[PDB]
Coordinates of all heavy atoms in Angstrom, one line a residue:
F1 N 5.3 -0.8 -21.2 CA 4.4 -1.6 -20.4 C 4.7 -1.5 -19.0 O 5.9 -1.4 -18.5 CB 4.5 -3.0 -20.9 CG 4.0 -3.3 -22.3 CD1 4.2 -4.6 -22.8 CD2 3.4 -2.4 -23.1 CE1 3.8 -4.9 -24.0 CE2 2.9 -2.8 -24.4 CZ 3.2 -4.1 -24.8
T2 N 3.6 -1.8 -18.2 CA 3.9 -2.1 -16.8 C 4.3 -3.5 -16.6 O 4.1 -4.3 -17.6 CB 2.6 -1.9 -16.0 OG1 1.6 -2.8 -16.5 CG2 2.0 -0.5 -15.9
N3 N 4.6 -3.9 -15.5 CA 4.9 -5.4 -15.2 C 3.7 -6.2 -15.5 O 3.8 -7.3 -16.0 CB 5.3 -5.7 -13.7 CG 6.7 -5.3 -13.5 OD1 7.6 -5.3 -14.4 ND2 7.2 -5.0 -12.2
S4 N 2.5 -5.7 -15.1 CA 1.3 -6.5 -15.2 C 0.9 -6.7 -16.8 O 0.5 -7.8 -17.2 CB 0.1 -5.8 -14.4 OG -1.1 -6.4 -14.8
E5 N 1.1 -5.7 -17.6 CA 1.0 -5.8 -19.0 C 2.0 -6.7 -19.7 O 1.7 -7.3 -20.7 CB 1.0 -4.4 -19.6 CG -0.2 -3.5 -19.2 CD -0.1 -2.0 -19.5 OE1 1.1 -1.4 -19.6 OE2 -1.1 -1.3 -19.6
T6 N 3.2 -6.7 -19.2 CA 4.3 -7.5 -19.7 C 3.9 -9.0 -19.5 O 4.1 -9.7 -20.4 CB 5.6 -7.2 -18.9 OG1 6.1 -5.9 -19.3 CG2 6.7 -8.1 -19.5
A7 N 3.4 -9.3 -18.3 CA 3.1 -10.6 -18.0 C 2.1 -11.1 -18.9 O 2.1 -12.3 -19.4 CB 2.6 -10.8 -16.5
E8 N 1.0 -10.3 -19.1 CA 0.0 -10.7 -20.1 C 0.5 -10.9 -21.6 O 0.2 -11.8 -22.2 CB -1.0 -9.6 -20.2 CG -2.2 -9.8 -21.2 CD -3.1 -10.9 -20.7 OE1 -3.1 -11.2 -19.5 OE2 -4.0 -11.4 -21.5
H9 N 1.3 -9.9 -22.0 CA 1.9 -9.9 -23.4 C 2.6 -11.3 -23.6 O 2.4 -12.0 -24.5 CB 2.9 -8.7 -23.4 CG 3.6 -8.5 -24.7 ND1 3.0 -7.9 -25.8 CD2 4.9 -8.8 -25.1 CE1 3.8 -7.8 -26.8 NE2 5.0 -8.3 -26.4
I10 N 3.5 -11.6 -22.6 CA 4.3 -12.9 -22.7 C 3.5 -14.1 -22.7 O 3.9 -15.1 -23.3 CB 5.3 -12.9 -21.4 CG1 6.4 -11.9 -21.6 CG2 5.8 -14.3 -21.2 CD1 7.0 -12.0 -22.9
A11 N 2.5 -14.2 -21.8 CA 1.7 -15.3 -21.6 C 0.9 -15.6 -22.9 O 0.4 -16.7 -23.1 CB 0.8 -15.2 -20.4
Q12 N 0.6 -14.5 -23.7 CA -0.2 -14.6 -24.9 C 0.7 -14.8 -26.1 O 0.3 -14.8 -27.3 CB -0.9 -13.3 -25.2 CG -2.0 -12.9 -24.4 CD -2.6 -11.5 -24.8 OE1 -2.0 -10.8 -25.7 NE2 -3.6 -11.0 -24.1
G13 N 2.0 -15.1 -25.8 CA 3.0 -15.7 -26.7 C 3.7 -14.6 -27.5 O 4.5 -14.9 -28.4
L14 N 3.5 -13.3 -27.1 CA 4.2 -12.1 -27.7 C 5.6 -12.0 -27.0 O 5.8 -12.4 -25.9 CB 3.4 -10.9 -27.7 CG 2.0 -11.1 -28.3 CD1 1.0 -9.8 -28.3 CD2 2.0 -11.6 -29.8
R15 N 6.5 -11.1 -27.7 CA 7.9 -11.2 -27.3 C 8.4 -9.8 -27.6 O 7.9 -8.9 -28.3 CB 8.7 -12.1 -28.2 CG 8.2 -13.7 -28.0 CD 8.5 -14.1 -26.6 NE 8.2 -15.5 -26.3 CZ 7.1 -15.9 -25.8 NH1 6.2 -15.2 -25.3 NH2 7.1 -17.3 -25.5
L16 N 9.6 -9.5 -27.0 CA 10.5 -8.4 -27.4 C 10.9 -8.7 -28.8 O 10.7 -9.7 -29.3 CB 11.8 -8.5 -26.6 CG 11.6 -8.2 -25.1 CD1 12.8 -8.6 -24.3 CD2 11.3 -6.8 -24.9
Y17 N 11.2 -7.6 -29.5 CA 11.6 -7.6 -30.9 C 13.0 -7.1 -31.1 O 13.7 -6.7 -30.1 CB 10.6 -7.0 -31.8 CG 10.3 -5.6 -31.7 CD1 10.9 -4.7 -32.5 CD2 9.4 -5.1 -30.8 CE1 10.7 -3.3 -32.4 CE2 9.1 -3.8 -30.6 CZ 9.8 -2.8 -31.5 OH 9.6 -1.5 -31.5
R18 N 13.5 -7.2 -32.3 CA 14.9 -7.0 -32.6 C 15.5 -5.6 -32.2 O 15.0 -4.6 -32.9 CB 15.1 -7.3 -34.1 CG 16.5 -7.3 -34.5 CD 16.6 -7.8 -35.9 NE 17.8 -7.4 -36.6 CZ 17.9 -7.4 -37.9 NH1 16.9 -7.7 -38.6 NH2 19.1 -6.9 -38.5
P19 N 16.5 -5.5 -31.4 CA 17.1 -4.2 -31.3 C 17.8 -3.8 -32.6 O 18.4 -4.7 -33.3 CB 18.2 -4.5 -30.2 CG 17.6 -5.6 -29.4 CD 16.9 -6.4 -30.4
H20 N 17.9 -2.6 -32.8 CA 18.5 -2.1 -34.1 C 19.9 -2.5 -34.3 O 20.4 -2.8 -35.4 CB 18.5 -0.5 -34.1 CG 17.1 0.1 -34.1 ND1 16.9 1.3 -33.8 CD2 16.1 -0.5 -34.7 CE1 15.6 1.6 -34.1 NE2 15.1 0.5 -34.6
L21 N 20.7 -2.6 -33.2 CA 22.1 -3.1 -33.3 C 22.4 -4.5 -33.4 O 23.5 -5.0 -33.7 CB 22.9 -2.5 -32.2 CG 23.1 -1.0 -32.2 CD1 23.7 -0.5 -30.9 CD2 24.1 -0.7 -33.3
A22 N 21.3 -5.4 -33.2 CA 21.4 -6.8 -33.4 C 21.2 -7.2 -34.8 O 20.2 -7.0 -35.4 CB 20.4 -7.5 -32.6
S23 N 22.2 -7.9 -35.4 CA 22.0 -8.6 -36.7 C 21.0 -9.7 -36.6 O 20.6 -10.1 -35.5 CB 23.3 -9.2 -37.1 OG 23.6 -10.3 -36.3
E24 N 20.5 -10.2 -37.7 CA 19.5 -11.3 -37.7 C 20.1 -12.5 -36.9 O 19.4 -13.1 -36.3 CB 19.1 -11.7 -39.2 CG 18.4 -10.6 -39.9 CD 18.3 -10.8 -41.4 OE1 17.6 -11.8 -41.9 OE2 19.0 -10.0 -42.1
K25 N 21.3 -12.8 -37.2 CA 21.9 -14.0 -36.4 C 22.0 -13.7 -34.9 O 21.7 -14.7 -34.2 CB 23.3 -14.2 -36.9 CG 23.4 -14.9 -38.3 CD 24.8 -15.1 -38.7 CE 24.9 -15.8 -40.1 NZ 24.1 -15.0 -41.1
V26 N 22.3 -12.5 -34.5 CA 22.3 -12.3 -33.0 C 20.8 -12.3 -32.5 O 20.5 -12.9 -31.4 CB 22.9 -10.9 -32.7 CG1 22.6 -10.5 -31.3 CG2 24.5 -10.9 -33.0
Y27 N 19.9 -11.8 -33.2 CA 18.5 -11.8 -32.9 C 17.9 -13.2 -32.7 O 17.3 -13.6 -31.8 CB 17.6 -11.0 -33.8 CG 16.2 -10.9 -33.4 CD1 15.7 -10.6 -32.2 CD2 15.2 -11.1 -34.4 CE1 14.4 -10.5 -31.8 CE2 13.8 -11.0 -34.1 CZ 13.4 -10.7 -32.9 OH 12.1 -10.5 -32.5
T28 N 18.4 -14.1 -33.6 CA 17.9 -15.5 -33.5 C 18.5 -16.1 -32.3 O 17.7 -17.0 -31.7 CB 18.5 -16.3 -34.7 OG1 18.0 -15.8 -36.0 CG2 18.4 -17.7 -34.6
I29 N 19.6 -15.8 -31.8 CA 20.1 -16.4 -30.6 C 19.3 -15.9 -29.4 O 18.8 -16.7 -28.6 CB 21.6 -16.0 -30.3 CG1 22.5 -16.5 -31.5 CG2 22.1 -16.5 -28.9 CD1 23.9 -16.1 -31.3
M30 N 19.1 -14.6 -29.3 CA 18.3 -14.2 -28.1 C 16.9 -14.7 -28.2 O 16.3 -15.1 -27.1 CB 18.4 -12.6 -27.8 CG 17.6 -11.9 -28.8 SD 17.6 -10.0 -28.6 CE 19.4 -9.7 -29.0
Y31 N 16.3 -14.8 -29.4 CA 14.9 -15.2 -29.5 C 14.8 -16.6 -29.2 O 13.7 -17.0 -28.6 CB 14.4 -14.9 -31.0 CG 12.9 -14.9 -31.1 CD1 12.2 -13.8 -31.0 CD2 12.2 -16.0 -31.4 CE1 10.8 -13.8 -31.1 CE2 10.8 -16.0 -31.6 CZ 10.2 -14.8 -31.5 OH 8.8 -14.9 -31.6
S32 N 15.7 -17.5 -29.4 CA 15.7 -18.9 -29.1 C 15.6 -19.1 -27.6 O 15.2 -20.1 -27.1 CB 17.0 -19.7 -29.6 OG 18.2 -19.4 -28.8

């Protein structure tokens, strides 16, 4: 995405998703 698309994505309540090396517990911390 461009910066402009990222800003839209975020403001619409969407997010980065889990890196492959992050366990569920680590993902829950970053997601919080």
Side-chain angles (χ1 to χ4, degrees):
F1 289 172
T2 62
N3 286 331
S4 170
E5 290 166 335
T6 297
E8 181 73 15
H9 183 78
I10 284 312
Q12 293 174 357
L14 309 175
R15 297 293 182 262
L16 295 166
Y17 64 95
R18 182 174 165 202
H20 291 160
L21 288 170
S23 67
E24 292 163 72
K25 285 181 184 49
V26 166
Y27 185 46
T28 291
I29 299 176
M30 74 181 66
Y31 198 89
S32 74

